[PDB]
């Protein structure tokens, strides 16, 4: 009775919406370009014009729907993405690496992780999860009964999710994955109580023995092809009686666990990025990649050494809820022990074969062959920004997070000697079913400040008050997007349901302002975590980078994606700048106080 509290997610008045479309577009586009959609965009509000009619129609959308953006976005955003789900959508995490030192810890740690999960699970189905808030607001909670018990289906057109959660036998058991070879285990008892550590870890150190050797083929790797080809691929795959049984066990578990092998370490310069590199695609074809099942909303990887963390399926829902979770579950696994009462009669796991045939031989060996090139084409780099956090920003009555997304501008400027299009994940949950919205960071004050820092023409006092401007001025936007005042979705919706209509594609969409502000050459959110963890994800474009950070109180985590087949971006040099740039930044403002 939460969900029917919360306001419905509005629609932006259209001539409210097309002017912050403008004003956006300023420092991003030529001063020619803009003149054009300037004629354009007056035409499309025109009192009795297409925008009018259009926007009648998203205004209906909403009273027949309990969100007009609900199924559009999720359809758009990843079901129709034919692209693989590795890197190019399923968002990795490095959580703090743990102290095991053995094959018998490395369990220890499984169980404790497993236990963590249920307890958090409980909140969930006996939906007594806390109310969480966005400033002063309920915030929906929707996201959390997607998550678990759930998997995403290849379709030969569209790609479908199957949720288990809330049916008539809702799953008990989770999925484990040791040397590709997969078990099924149960962590209920017939009476309802949940198992214990114990008994998991003596179910765990079960099917830990039954998977002893490694030598099978590492079908679950063909979750990583094109989505294509996984369809096809999937489609003959489960051909078989046991096949079939296999994947749909799979795909009800409550989540999966998967115990990856070891991998010739390297320097710990480059330490971060390994780890980070093995929890977001897994390190090729002949590592850890085939220990997994990207298709499957969460995946818990513990590795070897002592590392550990995650991958999931964006459609179920953003960062935020999931890491509400991780904190929950990293905290379970360091309090205190109550009961370790002795091992209750417990059944042996069964073991999810796969009949491998010469017809899915090649499926498999073309996996491989995909995986490893989308890989050694991913370029990471991990930065942790010591120097300061929340900490600083705030003591500047600066918001820490506009402050942080105008380093970037700054950083990226001082690179390329221009703005670019800027994209920020902005969460609409203080409306029922709502995801996110675009936060536009490259602005009017963005270039302003940019421009008016590295000009030795100015004065340092003339500096500070425009670095200032823009920090509140990109508040401002995070304000007005989180409160369905943004513009991007709005926009959007007027696009499909002018398709829909059957009307001619509007020329504001044609528009050459339109191929360049959705072309994001920055690609970021961030996702705060009680937990000093990380999050991260490839870039959106070739010719880009993916930025992911968690800002704490005292330092920031940072990750920053870009592809090798694009020369004119390095991970590392936009790192190495954004660095400098948050460092300046401080310098100029711990000079010039505003007072005292
Ligand atoms: C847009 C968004 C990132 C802004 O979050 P935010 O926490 O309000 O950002 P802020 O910079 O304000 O950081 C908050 C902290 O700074 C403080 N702060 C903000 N403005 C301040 C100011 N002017 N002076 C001093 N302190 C300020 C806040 O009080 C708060 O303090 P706290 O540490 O006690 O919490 C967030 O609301 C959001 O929408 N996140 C979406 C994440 C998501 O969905 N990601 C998807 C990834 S796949």
Same mark, same amino acid.
């Given at each position: 009775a939460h969900q029917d509290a919360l306001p419905r997610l509005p629609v932006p008045p259209?001539?409210?919406?097309?002017?912050?479309?403008?004003?956006?577009?300023? !420092?991003?586009?030529?001063?020619?370009?803009?003149?054009?959609?300037?004629?354009?965009?007056?035409?499309?509000?025109?009192?009795?014009?297409?925008?009018?009619?259009?926007?009648?129609?998203?205004?209906?959308?909403?009273?027949?729907?309990?969100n007009w953006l609900?199924?559009?976005?999720?359809?758009?955003?990843?079901?129709?993405?034919?692209?693989?789900?590795?890197?190019?959508?399923?968002?990795?995490?490095?959580?703090?690496?743990?102290?095991?030192?053995?094959?018998?810890?490395?369990?220890?740690?499984?169980?404790?992780?497993?236990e963590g999960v249920l307890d958090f699970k409980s909140m969930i189905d006996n939906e007594t999860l806390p109310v969480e808030f966005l400033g002063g607001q309920p915030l929906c909670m929707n996201q959390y009964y997607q998550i678990l018990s759930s998997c995403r289906v290849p379709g030969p057109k569209q790609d479908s999710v199957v949720n288990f959660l809330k049916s008539k036998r809702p799953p008990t058991h989770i999925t484990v994955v040791h040397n590709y070879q997969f078990f099924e285990?149960?962590?209920?008892?017939?009476?309802?109580?949940?198992?214990?550590?114990?008994?998991?870890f003596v179910q765990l150190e079960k099917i830990w023995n039954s998977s002893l050797q490694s030598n099978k083929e590492p079908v679950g790797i063909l979750t990583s092809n094109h989505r294509n080809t996984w369809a096809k691929a999937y489609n003959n795959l489960i051909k078989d009686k046991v096949n079939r049984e296999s994947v749909n066990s799979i795909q009800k578990s409550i989540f999966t666990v998967c115990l990856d092998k070891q991998v010739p370490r390297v320097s710990d310069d480059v330490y971060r990025n390994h780890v980070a590199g093995q929890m977001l695609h897994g390190g090729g074809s002949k590592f850890n990649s085939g220990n997994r099942w990207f298709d499957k909303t969460l995946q818990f990887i513990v590795a070897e050494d002592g590392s550990c963390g995650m991958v999931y399926e964006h459609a179920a829902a953003e960062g935020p809820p999931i890491v509400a979770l991780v904190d929950h579950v990293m905290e379970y696994t360091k309090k205190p022990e109550l009961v370790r009462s002795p091992m209750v009669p417990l059944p042996m796991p069964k073991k999810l074969r796969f009949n491998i045939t010469p017809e899915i031989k090649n499926d498999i060996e073309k996996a491989k062959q995909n995986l490893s090139i989308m890989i050694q084409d991913l370029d990471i780099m991990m930065l942790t920004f010591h120097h300061f956090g929340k900490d600083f920003p705030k003591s500047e009555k600066l918001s820490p997070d506009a402050f942080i997304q105008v380093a970037l501008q700054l950083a990226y400027y001082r690179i390329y000697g221009q703005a670019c299009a800027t994209y920020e994940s902005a969460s609409l949950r203080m409306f029922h079913l709502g995801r996110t919205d675009t936060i536009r960071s490259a602005s009017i004050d963005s270039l302003a400040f940019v421009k008016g820092m590295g000009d030795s023409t100015v004065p340092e006092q003339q500096k500070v008050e425009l670095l200032r401007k823009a920090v509140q001025a990109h508040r401002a936007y995070t304000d007005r997007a989180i409160r369905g005042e943004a513009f991007d979705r709005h926009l959007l919706g007027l696009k499909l349901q002018a398709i829909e209509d059957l009307v001619?594609?509007?020329?504001?969409?044609?528009?050459?302002?339109?191929?360049?502000?959705?072309?994001?050459?920055?690609?970021?959110?961030?996702? !705060?975590?009680?937990?000093?963890?990380?999050?991260?994800?490839?870039?959106?474009?070739?010719?880009?980078?993916?930025?992911?950070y968690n800002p704490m109180e005292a330092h920031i985590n940072f990750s920053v994606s870009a592809y090798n087949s694009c020369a004119e971006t390095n991970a590392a040099r936009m790192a190495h700048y954004l660095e400098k740039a948050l460092l300046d930044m401080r310098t100029l403002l711990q000079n010039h106080p505003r007072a005292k």
């Open positions: 259209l001539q409210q919406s097309l002017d912050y479309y403008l004003k956006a577009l300023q !420092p991003i586009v030529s001063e020619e370009e803009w003149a054009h959609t300037k004629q354009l965009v007056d035409e499309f509000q025109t009192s009795g014009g297409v925008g009018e009619r259009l926007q009648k129609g998203l205004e209906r959308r909403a009273k027949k729907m309990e609900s199924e559009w976005w999720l359809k758009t955003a990843y079901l129709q993405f034919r692209q693989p789900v590795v890197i190019y959508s399923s968002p990795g995490v490095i959580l703090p690496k743990q102290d095991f030192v053995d094959l018998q810890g490395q369990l220890r740690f499984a169980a404790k992780l497993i285990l149960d962590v209920y008892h017939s009476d309802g109580t949940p198992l214990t550590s114990d008994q998991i001619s594609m509007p020329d504001i969409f044609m528009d050459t302002s339109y191929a360049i502000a959705m072309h994001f050459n920055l690609s970021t959110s961030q996702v !705060p975590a009680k937990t000093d963890c990380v999050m991260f994800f490839g870039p959106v474009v070739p010719d880009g980078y993916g930025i992911c």
